[PDB]
Design a protein around this motif. Structure first.
Motif, PDB file in Angstrom:
ATOM      1  N   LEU B  26       8.788   3.009   6.652  1.00 29.00           N
ATOM      2  CA  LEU B  26       8.527   3.322   5.558  1.00 29.00           C
ATOM      3  C   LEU B  26       9.419   4.662   5.061  1.00 29.00           C
ATOM      4  O   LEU B  26       9.601   5.260   4.099  1.00 29.00           O
ATOM      5  N   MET B  30      11.527   6.380   1.790  1.00 26.15           N
ATOM      6  CA  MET B  30      10.476   8.069   1.106  1.00 26.15           C
ATOM      7  C   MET B  30      12.217   9.061   1.282  1.00 26.15           C
ATOM      8  O   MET B  30      11.643   9.511   1.137  1.00 26.15           O
TER       9      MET B  30
ATOM     10  N   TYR C  29       0.960  -2.620   5.715  1.00 29.81           N
ATOM     11  CA  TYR C  29       1.706  -1.990   5.643  1.00 29.81           C
ATOM     12  C   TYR C  29       3.037  -2.468   4.458  1.00 29.81           C
ATOM     13  O   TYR C  29       3.137  -2.061   3.985  1.00 29.81           O
ATOM     14  N   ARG C  32       0.500  -1.023   1.688  1.00 25.26           N
ATOM     15  CA  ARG C  32       1.384   0.538   2.020  1.00 25.26           C
ATOM     16  C   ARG C  32       2.807   0.806   0.960  1.00 25.26           C
ATOM     17  O   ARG C  32       3.217   2.011   0.521  1.00 25.26           O
ATOM     18  N   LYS C  33       3.989  -0.205   1.545  1.00 20.38           N
ATOM     19  CA  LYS C  33       4.968   0.515   1.038  1.00 20.38           C
ATOM     20  C   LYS C  33       4.733  -0.988  -0.472  1.00 20.38           C
ATOM     21  O   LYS C  33       5.814   0.049  -1.173  1.00 20.38           O
ATOM     22  N   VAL C  36       2.713   3.542  -1.617  1.00 24.43           N
ATOM     23  CA  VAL C  36       3.338   4.349  -1.694  1.00 24.43           C
ATOM     24  C   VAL C  36       4.316   4.989  -2.201  1.00 24.43           C
ATOM     25  O   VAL C  36       4.575   6.494  -2.650  1.00 24.43           O
ATOM     26  N   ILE C  37       5.328   4.620  -1.944  1.00 30.90           N
ATOM     27  CA  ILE C  37       6.607   5.215  -2.745  1.00 30.90           C
ATOM     28  C   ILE C  37       6.844   4.980  -3.873  1.00 30.90           C
ATOM     29  O   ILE C  37       6.726   4.269  -4.724  1.00 30.90           O
ATOM     30  N   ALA C  66       2.700  11.098  -0.304  1.00 30.55           N
ATOM     31  CA  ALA C  66       3.434  10.387   1.285  1.00 30.55           C
ATOM     32  C   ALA C  66       4.476  11.777   1.192  1.00 30.55           C
ATOM     33  O   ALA C  66       5.136  11.746   0.262  1.00 30.55           O
ATOM     34  N   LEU C 149      -7.733  -2.068   3.520  1.00 31.58           N
ATOM     35  CA  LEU C 149      -8.216  -3.941   3.780  1.00 31.58           C
ATOM     36  C   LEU C 149      -9.476  -3.691   3.579  1.00 31.58           C
ATOM     37  O   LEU C 149      -9.472  -5.370   3.462  1.00 31.58           O
TER      38      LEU C 149
ATOM     39  N   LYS D 143     -12.957  -8.161  10.150  1.00 32.74           N
ATOM     40  CA  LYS D 143     -11.164  -7.594   9.459  1.00 32.74           C
ATOM     41  C   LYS D 143     -10.655  -6.711   9.401  1.00 32.74           C
ATOM     42  O   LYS D 143      -9.400  -6.675   9.838  1.00 32.74           O
TER      43      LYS D 143
END
Ligand SMILES: [Mg+2]
Ligand SMILES: [Mg+2]
Ligand SMILES: [Mg+2]
Ligand SMILES: [Mg+2]
Ligand SMILES: [Mg+2]
Ligand SMILES: [Mg+2]
Ligand SMILES: [Mg+2]
Ligand SMILES: [Mg+2]
Ligand SMILES: [Mg+2]
Lengths: 202, 159, 293, 176
Positions: B26, B30, C29, C32-33, C36-37, C66, C149, D143
């Motif tokens: 990532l 960024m 992720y 997350r990708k 956050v971006i 981030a 999650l 999970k």
RNA sequence: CGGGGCGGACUGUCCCCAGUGCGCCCCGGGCGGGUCGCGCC
RNA sequence: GGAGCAGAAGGGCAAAAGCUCGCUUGAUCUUGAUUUUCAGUACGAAUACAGACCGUGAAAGCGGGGCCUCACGAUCCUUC
RNA sequence: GUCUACGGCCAUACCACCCUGAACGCGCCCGAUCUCGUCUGAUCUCGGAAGCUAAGCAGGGUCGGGCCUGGUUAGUACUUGGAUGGGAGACCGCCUGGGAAUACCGGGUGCUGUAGGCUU
């Protein structure tokens, strides 16, 4: 039938093995690469003699089989049936093509396989006891007569068909850094498990 | 002979390195890019959107335009006998910055501080860089011992 | 000695591990990708997300953005810091998530100085509310929601924390579909049972039901309610006083404890000479044992 | 005593799933009755299981309905397992225990124990698979922050047999 | 190539056992780099 | 990942891009820019945006066809 | 000295097995009234707190396997430029520069950002 080998003596065609893309290849003439008493352990046959090329060229499977046969016959009627072990160290993986009996659509069809050998490269090897050295040299010379190029006969500084020298061989065996199994030997490095050292060194 | 497909011949260059597949890290997303800075063009193959052409892989350009996910870059491409500036829209997974221009900028700032200190302290100091001069006469101590005699070896055939 | 082993030398030679937090099972992720971006034509605008994590005994609400070296927490609330006013027991439930989100929102905007405006909803009704930016005053804080999650369904404490933050005064985009007042089959939002869930009236009803049905299973379930003597009455008012205390003084302050020693609680990593001597005397003891025989 | 009384809070073999299954090569009313026996035996609505590929030898094609199975856990599971071992007279012989500490057997006719026979319902047999566990095995299917259960927390064949004969005073290793 | 006093951990010679690293300062030996170094050639 | 992702092959992909459900029609309406072949012409294909109207999702977002590299066609005439 | 929450680089971090874990915590754990999901409250969702480090997790270990980084292999293999060099060729030597990769032998085995805890 088969062309003269001078038409395919030289390596000029970018290695061509039989695969997906090269189908319909006949079988090579050499099928047996090991011969003699192949079960002698490591120290029955301490002396190794190689026949090694000195030319960059390709040898045919027919020539490999002829040399294997004549060297085997001389070794059999000289050192006895079970007194030697020979390995040819050269497999015919390169397929040679033939064009059909003009030049339109001229890409040939597979007619044989050859082995491409380099300058420093072993063609054949014989391991025997230390007292048949002249017999090994004579067998390798009479087999040298079956190839196009120039070959040299050389007795190795190593024990049989191994990669360890004859002077440091028995010392490594005695200090158990080198454990015999089959035709060859295993090297024991001092960085395994200590439980492996314990099932060994004992 | 060959095709004019857009990914012809890119079997290895648009592939991933060994044990480097999977999720894109990532930090590459960024990074920031202002219009005017120098970027390298590589073009990974996990992302298929906005990917540059194979002629622009391994190249270097400057940013002229910033959008949501991509960047307009001015790159020099050599067509047969001329060099011309092409304008390509490439994504940020396919670009990264240029440490060459970064190094040049930090030695610019070092030059400016050095000229300021020289001006205030009243000296003259060297600002340019010079290409690796010859080697400044010197003594070599033997430390009493005699230099070791080397000698070519005989020939033995091993392999 | 019959089956081909699978995790062999070549297996580990070309095994590629996943990311550390992926193979620890804590970070998605993909999300997350996507979450956050920032857009590249913003260039430096921090993108704020409200992380909500409900553990076995605690609820954590953070607000982050981030950077390349790692995320940057701006404000953080805790259910374990909740009992220093109002409540004392009954954490990690939906009402606790609401007060935690409320505390996080009020703490953030009184840190930013926007507490005298953006009062959110000083009285609690479980209906749809969204703050708006008063002209001439600074804009409302904009945050998104990081649920991680946690499986988002109707009646999740992550949405409890979202409702808490939105009533605190943050602007988090949402819909009332994943709120406990929402009915699926009529596509309708009731909001009075949502207010009940915010006030913890379902737990109070469970307590009353268990009391009229039983004594020993009731105290076995709600043992730590008998301590501090939280009856099923005075539960909502108690939460009202908790909300009032959060609105009164939401500033966090910590305590100093620096008179500590430097005791090792782990084992130091062994050294090379120690390992070599260890294998040396192990070989020596083995040979000594086999000469004792 | 002192060294044995430490693990007794959290290291106890208990019964996870009972894994009841009926597989019959045909679809239709036979499967409906094979589900009806499962409902009347367990109290749960069972679940149909489809073929995966056509084989044509005994004759099934894919995406059919072949099996009815059901998962039962808890007090109901232990009492139904009690009934199955009452039918087996607490004897299952040598090798029904898998190397992961699970086991199971088959019952050829269900009416013996429990429920009374119904003339519409058939004569179906079934099989029991008990997969057995230990508190803390749920981390394998959690999970968030999933893990593997750890080496000495596993169930071996030896401790599975030991638990079976200790909890049901049964007999392993018959005369053969 | 090392000696004195305090802190962990290892070995099938574990009460009489042995050996290893780390923390304090005291020294002991030898090597190199800077010092108005300081003289002498 | 030795499977699958419509097909040739190559690349890519694992709480995916695979498989199973839920809801849908971003395979819609528009102007320009760019890349690819290139003469830096066109078609085809594609990539970044921008302006509408929407879909989905709690949301960030993602989506103007197919995970990417192929799958297609001027003037004149006809038709809507 | 550590841990939680979110991470960054993405095995020096993985894998196999063994030992230790004070306090907070993280979990395992108890239950199905509500929310919500299942053939099954096992998973997911919710309500808890009697017990527990057994497990996850953390730290350490293994003449561990992998991985990382050096040495060796080796100025070897290959190669830029040069010759009215050699050799019937195949190829090879030299001049001018650059310069690898296994096998084998060492050493190492997660650093670190923001916020909040515990450790007298
Ligand atoms: Mg040719
Ligand atoms: Mg071609
Ligand atoms: Mg072609
Ligand atoms: Mg596409
Ligand atoms: Mg998600
Ligand atoms: Mg939308
Ligand atoms: Mg649009
Ligand atoms: Mg190792
Ligand atoms: Mg040279």
């Amino acid at each position: 039938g088969r062309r003269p080998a001078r038409c395919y003596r030289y390596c000029k065609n970018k290695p061509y093995p039989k695969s997906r893309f090269c189908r319909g290849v006949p079988d090579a003439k050499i099928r047996i690469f090991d011969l003699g008493r192949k079960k002698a352990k490591v120290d029955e046959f301490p002396l190794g003699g190689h026949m090694v090329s000195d030319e960059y060229e390709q040898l045919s499977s027919e020539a490999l089989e002829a040399a294997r046969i004549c060297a085997n016959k001389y070794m059999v009627k000289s050192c006895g049936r079970d007194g030697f072990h020979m390995r040819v160290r050269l497999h015919p993986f390169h397929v040679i093509r033939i064009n059909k009996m003009g030049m339109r659509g001229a890409f040939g069809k597979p007619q044989g396989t050859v082995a491409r050998v380099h300058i420093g490269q072993v063609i054949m090897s014989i391991r025997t006891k230390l007292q048949n050295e002249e017999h090994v040299i004579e067998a390798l010379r009479r087999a040298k007569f079956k190839f196009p190029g120039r070959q040299k006969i050389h007795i190795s500084k190593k024990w049989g068909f191994t990669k360890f020298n004859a002077d440091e061989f028995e010392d490594m065996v005695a200090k158990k850094c080198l454990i015999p199994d089959g035709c060859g030997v295993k090297y024991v490095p001092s960085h395994g498990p200590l439980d492996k050292w314990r099932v060994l060194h004992s | 002979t060959n095709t004019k497909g857009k990914r012809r011949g890119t079997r290895y260059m648009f592939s991933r390195p060994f044990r480097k597949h999977g999720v894109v890290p990532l930090a590459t997303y960024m990074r920031i890019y202002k219009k005017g800075d120098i970027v390298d063009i590589k073009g990974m193959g996990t992302v298929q959107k906005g990917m540059p052409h194979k002629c622009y892989h391994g190249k270097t350009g400057r940013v002229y335009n910033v959008t949501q996910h991509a960047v307009g870059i001015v790159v020099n491409k050599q067509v047969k006998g001329k060099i011309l500036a092409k304008r390509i829209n490439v994504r940020i997974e396919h670009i990264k910055h240029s440490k060459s221009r970064d190094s040049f900028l930090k030695r610019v700032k070092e030059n400016d501080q050095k000229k300021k200190e020289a001006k205030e302290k009243g000296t003259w100091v060297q600002l340019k860089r010079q290409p690796a001069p010859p080697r400044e006469a010197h003594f070599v101590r033997t430390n009493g011992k005699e230099p070791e005699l080397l000698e070519p070896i005989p020939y033995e055939f091993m392999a | 000695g019959f089956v081909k082993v699978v995790k062999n030398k070549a297996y580990f030679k070309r095994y590629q591990v996943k990311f550390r937090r992926r193979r620890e099972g804590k970070t998605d992720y993909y999300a997350r990708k996507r979450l956050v971006i920032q857009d590249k034509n913003k260039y430096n605008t921090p993108k704020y997300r409200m992380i909500v994590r409900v553990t076995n005994r605690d609820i954590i609400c953070q607000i982050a953005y981030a950077r390349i070296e790692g995320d940057m927490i701006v404000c953080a609330a805790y259910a374990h810091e909740l009992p220093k006013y109002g409540v004392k027991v009954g954490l990690t439930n939906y009402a606790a998530a609401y007060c935690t989100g409320l505390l996080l929102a009020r703490r953030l905007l009184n840190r930013f100085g926007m507490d005298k405006i953006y009062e959110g909803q000083v009285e609690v009704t479980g209906d749809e509310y969204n703050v708006e930016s008063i002209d001439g005053q600074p804009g409302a804080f904009t945050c998104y929601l990081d649920a991680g999650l946690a499986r988002t369904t109707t009646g999740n404490k992550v949405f409890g924390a979202l409702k808490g933050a939105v009533d605190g005064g943050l602007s988090i985009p949402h819909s009332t579909k994943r709120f406990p007042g929402y009915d699926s089959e009529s596509k309708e939002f009731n909001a009075e049972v949502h207010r009940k869930h915010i006030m913890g009236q379902n737990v109070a009803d469970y307590m009353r039901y268990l009391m009229e049905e039983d004594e020993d299973a009731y105290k076995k379930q709600f043992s730590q309610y008998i301590k501090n003597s939280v009856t099923p009455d005075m539960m909502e008012e108690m939460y009202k006083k908790a909300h009032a205390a959060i609105r009164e003084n939401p500033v966090y302050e910590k305590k100093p404890k620096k008179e500590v020693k430097k005791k090792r609680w782990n084992r130091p990593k062994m050294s090379l000479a120690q390992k070599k001597d260890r294998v040396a005397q192990k070989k020596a003891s083995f040979l000594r044992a086999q000469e004792r025989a | 005593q002192d060294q044995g009384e430490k693990e007794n809070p959290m290291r106890e073999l208990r019964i996870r799933k009972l894994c009841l299954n009926i597989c019959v090569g045909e679809s239709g009313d036979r499967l409906t009755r094979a589900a009806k026996v499962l409902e009347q035996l367990t109290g749960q609505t069972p679940v149909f299981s489809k073929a995966r590929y056509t084989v044509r030898s005994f004759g099934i094609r894919r995406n059919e309905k072949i099996a009815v199975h059901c998962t039962v856990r808890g007090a109901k599971a232990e009492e139904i397992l009690e009934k199955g071992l009452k039918v087996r007279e607490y004897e299952l012989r040598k090798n029904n225990f898998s190397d992961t500490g699970n086991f199971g057997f088959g019952i050829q006719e269900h009416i013996d124990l429990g429920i009374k026979y119904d003339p519409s319902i058939g004569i179906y047999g079934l099989d029991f698979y008990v997969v057995l566990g230990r508190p803390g095995f749920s981390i394998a299917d959690k999970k968030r922050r999933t893990g593997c259960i750890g080496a000495k927390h596993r169930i071996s064949k030896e401790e599975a047999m030991r638990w079976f004969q200790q909890k049901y005073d049964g007999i392993i290793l018959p005369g053969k």
